[PDB]
Amino acid sequence: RICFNHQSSQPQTTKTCSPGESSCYHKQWSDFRGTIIERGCGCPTVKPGIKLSCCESEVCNN
Amino acid sequence: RICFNHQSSQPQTTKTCSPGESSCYHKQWSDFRGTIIERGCGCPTVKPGIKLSCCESEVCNN
Protein backbone atom coordinates (compact mmCIF):
# COMPACT_ATOMS: atom_id res chain seq x y z
CA ARG A 1 0.00 0.00 0.00
CA ILE A 2 1.13 3.53 -0.93
CA CYS A 3 -0.24 6.47 0.97
CA PHE A 4 0.21 10.20 0.70
CA ASN A 5 2.31 11.56 3.65
CA HIS A 6 2.56 15.30 2.89
CA GLN A 7 1.27 17.88 5.35
CA SER A 8 -1.54 20.34 4.62
CA SER A 9 -1.05 21.99 1.21
CA GLN A 10 2.62 21.08 0.71
CA PRO A 11 3.59 19.27 -2.51
CA GLN A 12 2.22 15.75 -2.71
CA THR A 13 4.58 13.06 -1.45
CA THR A 14 4.07 9.40 -0.63
CA LYS A 15 5.19 6.64 1.64
CA THR A 16 5.32 2.94 0.91
CA CYS A 17 3.64 1.26 3.85
CA SER A 18 4.77 -1.80 5.82
CA PRO A 19 3.76 -5.20 4.46
CA GLY A 20 0.16 -5.95 5.36
CA GLU A 21 -0.64 -2.35 6.46
CA SER A 22 -3.72 -1.66 4.21
CA SER A 23 -4.95 1.69 5.49
CA CYS A 24 -4.04 5.32 4.82
CA TYR A 25 -5.22 8.18 7.04
CA HIS A 26 -6.08 11.89 6.95
CA LYS A 27 -6.02 13.76 10.30
CA GLN A 28 -7.23 17.42 10.45
CA TRP A 29 -7.27 20.10 13.16
CA SER A 30 -6.63 23.85 13.38
CA ASP A 31 -3.63 25.85 14.55
CA PHE A 32 -2.92 29.54 14.44
CA ARG A 33 -1.66 28.86 10.89
CA GLY A 34 -5.14 27.69 9.75
CA THR A 35 -6.30 24.19 8.84
CA ILE A 36 -3.67 21.52 9.43
CA ILE A 37 -3.78 18.09 7.81
CA GLU A 38 -1.51 15.14 8.60
CA ARG A 39 -1.39 12.15 6.26
CA GLY A 40 0.23 8.71 6.30
CA CYS A 41 0.02 4.93 6.57
CA GLY A 42 -2.31 3.30 9.08
CA CYS A 43 -5.33 4.46 11.03
CA PRO A 44 -4.34 6.10 14.32
CA THR A 45 -6.44 6.81 17.37
CA VAL A 46 -7.10 10.54 17.74
CA LYS A 47 -8.15 12.75 20.64
CA PRO A 48 -11.76 13.87 20.48
CA GLY A 49 -12.38 16.86 18.18
CA ILE A 50 -9.61 15.86 15.77
CA LYS A 51 -11.12 14.83 12.42
CA LEU A 52 -9.94 11.40 11.22
CA SER A 53 -10.68 9.51 8.00
CA CYS A 54 -9.09 6.13 7.05
CA CYS A 55 -9.18 4.59 3.55
CA GLU A 56 -8.35 1.29 1.96
CA SER A 57 -7.00 1.95 -1.54
CA GLU A 58 -3.85 3.30 -3.22
CA VAL A 59 -3.09 6.96 -2.47
CA CYS A 60 -6.64 7.52 -1.18
CA ASN A 61 -5.86 10.07 1.56
CA ASN A 62 -5.46 13.31 -0.37
CA ARG B 1 -23.59 10.22 14.91
CA ILE B 2 -25.21 11.82 11.85
CA CYS B 3 -23.99 10.70 8.40
CA PHE B 4 -24.70 11.69 4.79
CA ASN B 5 -26.58 8.90 2.99
CA HIS B 6 -27.17 10.45 -0.45
CA GLN B 7 -25.97 8.87 -3.66
CA SER B 8 -23.36 10.51 -5.87
CA SER B 9 -24.59 14.02 -6.75
CA GLN B 10 -28.19 13.73 -5.49
CA PRO B 11 -29.18 16.41 -2.98
CA GLN B 12 -27.61 16.07 0.44
CA THR B 13 -29.59 13.89 2.81
CA THR B 14 -28.55 12.40 6.18
CA LYS B 15 -29.23 9.38 8.33
CA THR B 16 -29.19 9.33 12.15
CA CYS B 17 -27.05 6.29 13.07
CA SER B 18 -27.76 3.72 15.74
CA PRO B 19 -26.55 4.54 19.23
CA GLY B 20 -22.84 3.74 19.65
CA GLU B 21 -22.10 4.03 15.92
CA SER B 22 -19.15 6.39 15.49
CA SER B 23 -18.29 6.05 11.77
CA CYS B 24 -19.70 7.11 8.45
CA TYR B 25 -18.58 5.64 5.11
CA HIS B 26 -17.94 6.70 1.51
CA LYS B 27 -17.84 3.92 -1.16
CA GLN B 28 -16.97 4.71 -4.79
CA TRP B 29 -16.54 2.81 -8.03
CA SER B 30 -16.92 3.40 -11.70
CA ASP B 31 -19.12 1.67 -14.27
CA PHE B 32 -20.69 2.29 -17.70
CA ARG B 33 -22.81 5.05 -16.16
CA GLY B 34 -20.14 7.13 -14.42
CA THR B 35 -18.70 7.41 -10.93
CA ILE B 36 -21.00 6.02 -8.33
CA ILE B 37 -20.84 7.08 -4.72
CA GLU B 38 -22.72 5.42 -1.90
CA ARG B 39 -22.70 6.92 1.64
CA GLY B 40 -24.07 5.90 5.06
CA CYS B 41 -23.48 4.90 8.64
CA GLY B 42 -20.75 2.50 9.73
CA CYS B 43 -17.78 1.12 7.82
CA PRO B 44 -18.79 -1.90 5.73
CA THR B 45 -16.74 -4.52 4.03
CA VAL B 46 -16.38 -4.05 0.23
CA LYS B 47 -15.34 -6.12 -2.84
CA PRO B 48 -11.83 -5.68 -4.27
CA GLY B 49 -11.74 -2.73 -6.66
CA ILE B 50 -14.23 -0.62 -4.73
CA LYS B 51 -12.80 2.46 -2.99
CA LEU B 52 -13.78 2.69 0.69
CA SER B 53 -13.16 5.55 3.17
CA CYS B 54 -14.59 5.69 6.76
CA CYS B 55 -14.56 8.75 9.06
CA GLU B 56 -15.41 9.43 12.67
CA SER B 57 -16.98 12.87 12.94
CA GLU B 58 -20.41 14.34 12.15
CA VAL B 59 -21.43 14.38 8.46
CA CYS B 60 -17.83 13.66 7.57
CA ASN B 61 -18.54 11.48 4.52
CA ASN B 62 -19.52 13.99 1.78
UniProtKB/Swiss-Prot annotation, chains A, B:
Where is it mostly found?
A: secreted
Residues the record marks as site: Very important residue for binding to acetylcholine receptor? 7, 29, 31, 36, 38, 47
Quote the function comment for this protein: Binds with high affinity to muscular nicotinic acetylcholine receptors (nAChRs) (tested on Torpedo marmorata, Kd=0.07 nM), and with low affinity to neuronal alpha-7/CHRNA7 nAChRs (tested on chimeric alpha-7/CHRNA7, Kd=22 uM) and inhibit acetylcholine from binding to the receptor, thereby impairing neuromuscular transmission. Produces peripheral paralysis by blocking neuromuscular transmission at the postsynaptic site.
Residues of the region (Loop I) are 3-17
Question: Which pairs of Cys residues are joined through disulfide bonds in the record?
Answer: 3-24, 17-41, 43-54, 55-60
Give the keywords, sorted: Acetylcholine receptor inhibiting toxin, Disulfide bond, Ion channel impairing toxin, Neurotoxin, Postsynaptic neurotoxin, Secreted, Signal, Toxin
Site note Key residue for binding to acetylcholine receptor, residues: 8, 10, 27, 33
Please state what the protein is called. Answer: Erabutoxin b
Q: Where is this region: Loop III?
A: 43-54
- Parent-protein start and end of this portion: 22 to 83 of 83
